[PDB]
Design an enzyme around this catalytic site. Sequence first.
Site, short mmCIF file in Angstrom:
data_model
loop_
_atom_site.label_atom_id
_atom_site.label_comp_id
_atom_site.label_asym_id
_atom_site.label_seq_id
_atom_site.Cartn_x
_atom_site.Cartn_y
_atom_site.Cartn_z
N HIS A 39 -5.82 -21.54 10.16
CA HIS A 39 -7.12 -21.99 9.71
C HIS A 39 -7.87 -20.88 8.97
O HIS A 39 -8.44 -21.12 7.90
CB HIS A 39 -7.98 -22.51 10.86
N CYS A 92 -7.29 -28.23 11.07
CA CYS A 92 -8.48 -29.06 11.15
C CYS A 92 -8.16 -30.54 11.00
O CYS A 92 -8.97 -31.37 11.41
CB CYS A 92 -9.50 -28.56 10.13
N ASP A 105 -7.94 -7.64 -0.05
CA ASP A 105 -7.11 -7.79 1.13
C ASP A 105 -7.95 -7.43 2.34
O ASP A 105 -8.83 -6.58 2.25
CB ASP A 105 -5.88 -6.86 1.14
N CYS A 137 -7.41 -27.73 6.00
CA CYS A 137 -6.18 -27.18 6.51
C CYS A 137 -5.55 -28.09 7.57
O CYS A 137 -6.19 -28.98 8.13
CB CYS A 137 -6.40 -25.77 7.05
N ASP A 180 0.83 -1.19 0.00
CA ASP A 180 0.00 0.00 0.00
C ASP A 180 0.88 1.25 0.00
O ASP A 180 2.11 1.19 0.05
CB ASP A 180 -1.04 -0.04 1.11
N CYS A 191 -13.04 -28.28 6.17
CA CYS A 191 -11.79 -27.60 5.89
C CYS A 191 -10.63 -28.57 5.76
O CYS A 191 -10.46 -29.47 6.58
CB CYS A 191 -11.51 -26.63 7.04
ZN LIG Z 1 -9.15 -25.49 8.99
#
Ligand SMILES: [Zn+2]
Lengths: 373, 373
Positions: free
Chosen positions: B339, B313, B270, B310, B93, B308
Amino acid sequence: DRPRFSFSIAAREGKARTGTIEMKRGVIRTPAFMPVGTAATVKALKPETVRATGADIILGNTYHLMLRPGAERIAKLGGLHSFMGFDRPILTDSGGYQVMSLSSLTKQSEEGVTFKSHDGSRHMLSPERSIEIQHLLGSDIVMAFDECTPYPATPSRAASSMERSMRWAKRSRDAFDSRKEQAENAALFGIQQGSVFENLRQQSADALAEIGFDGYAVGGLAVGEGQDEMFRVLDFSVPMLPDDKPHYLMGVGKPDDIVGAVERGIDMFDCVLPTRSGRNGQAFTWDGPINIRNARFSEDLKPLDSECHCAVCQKWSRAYIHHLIRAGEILGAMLMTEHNIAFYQQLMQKIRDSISEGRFSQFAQDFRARYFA
Amino acid sequence: DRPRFSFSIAAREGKARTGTIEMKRGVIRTPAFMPVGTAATVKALKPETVRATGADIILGNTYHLMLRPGAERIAKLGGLHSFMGFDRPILTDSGGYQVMSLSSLTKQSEEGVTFKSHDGSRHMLSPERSIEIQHLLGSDIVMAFDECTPYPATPSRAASSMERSMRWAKRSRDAFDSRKEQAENAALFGIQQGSVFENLRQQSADALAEIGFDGYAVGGLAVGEGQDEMFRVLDFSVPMLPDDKPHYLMGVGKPDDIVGAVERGIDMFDCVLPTRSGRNGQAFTWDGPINIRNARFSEDLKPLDSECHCAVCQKWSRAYIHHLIRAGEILGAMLMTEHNIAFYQQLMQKIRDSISEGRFSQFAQDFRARYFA
Ligand SMILES: [Zn+2]
Ligand SMILES: [Zn+2]
């Protein structure tokens, strides 16, 4: 499949030993350093990162866990290993030391200690309840419940405290043995007390050996007496313990303390120093500790340590970590902690290899000459 | 080898588009979500973890970096990519927005803004100096220096602010072009202003297109106007921008804001929401956000989200993360942040795939029905 507990000594040099402890959840290489998990986490590290640094076992603090999230709750959820995602051995302390240091309105008796949570909630802790909590957590190495005698202590007070701790050691043994699942799958360590007094250290060792434990801790040191005095007490105290079982020096310590304690027959260590002081900007190096917040590091592109094999030293500069710690960034704590724990594990590996090769005395001399240059 | 900048649209559904931006340091899949790095770190994540979640690009805040560690210092040390260990594209930015929100004793003029560090040190920021700082950091996508008009704004004030920002856009273009290394290796985005007024949004789009930029941001939204009004302004504002260049909605946002903005032609986003609110206990799930600190999660063995993919998880329960956040543990911030950023990237992937397959309208309906159930 591995036994409940087997300690085997593979090599010796003077009083120093190197070998392995086999347990159901893994092998522990000795001499060993245990990173400390205070409230079901080694602060700022995933368990996979703890393992990647070389740790074979961690220490879990019982006092914090019995208050938050609670031992019964952790048991309901599957035990500490499942809860935090660390599947290798965990040694748990008894909770007694932090009750005294951290809690309020404590009342001691022959039965145990009652205390107010540092919440104000009330609680008891006896040998029986401590062993039970450690069972509920699913500890692999259970510590007997005792008192860490204050320093300095008069001979009379040190004796009274040690004698109570030995009565509590027998109660801890009996509680552990009366729980079949615990007795069959975990190990129990007893703790030598006696302050700085050789006769009391001997009485304590004799009492613990008569009861019988899987390992023996040297308690009551690193309580303000200084390294010279600590080493003087270790000189006579460690030979009093059974030679064929692990010797655990609780709450030690700085790298030089570890080296000197191994020279005196210690096999296991824990301390918050690498994690706590890492978050506060202290990084360990082969040339001594540095404080990364110092302005001299602001444009230093070298890694924390020039020889360290850890992922932090492969990827990031002193200048970046200096910035992170000065800025209060979480990644600063993460990187400092990973490096410091990796450094400690590399120290332990060098100790093990040097004993195995019959050159530990030379290693200790070379280590000190450089670390204190 | 990749070009300096190439945006290619692979598929469209209504006003929504999916495609790629090729740059020297990597390919960016659009629509894209950029995690925010505030002071040379995506808070609580190593760069490898940022990448593992699926991010192709991050946003670096200039205001913080120009104060600490300093732009010249970062340049001396090899640039932001080397400093923080993130080798893919970074969008920076301009610094102007945080000067106004965070610093003190600001003085605005046609030349730029003078301000006191939130330190008390003094500093200027002009279009030329902003572009220079972004060069010193080694930014891949440079934002023109402008003013985010407050909301609400009168038509007169919105016009005056937009007109100054367009004069500043030309100055930003000329500064960028007069630095050969920057012009040859980075891209420059211009920012549409005009508050909520269609005629001013059109004048701003026309001015930016006449100057010419590699991409076009919609500025001045998500400043308190609410989703209905934001969407109303996007409805007429995005079609004013060149169709063949990326459209970047700055500082947005919640999952539903992202979906609706993509429906209106936005390609890039963003926001600090996933990182900041993650540290504060808010976890995103397909069934809506949850606050993990709530007592209802204390014994919940399910992962944060049931679908999820990830690493968090796969490995840890709600109950464990609840404990960590309540205890103030760093690992709690680490896990929640990983996460949430992974969730955002999975949302973007579902958006891209659904546009590519001509079923984005249905995805948006299904997403909302479940997220707001
Ligand atoms: Zn997750
Ligand atoms: Zn290192």
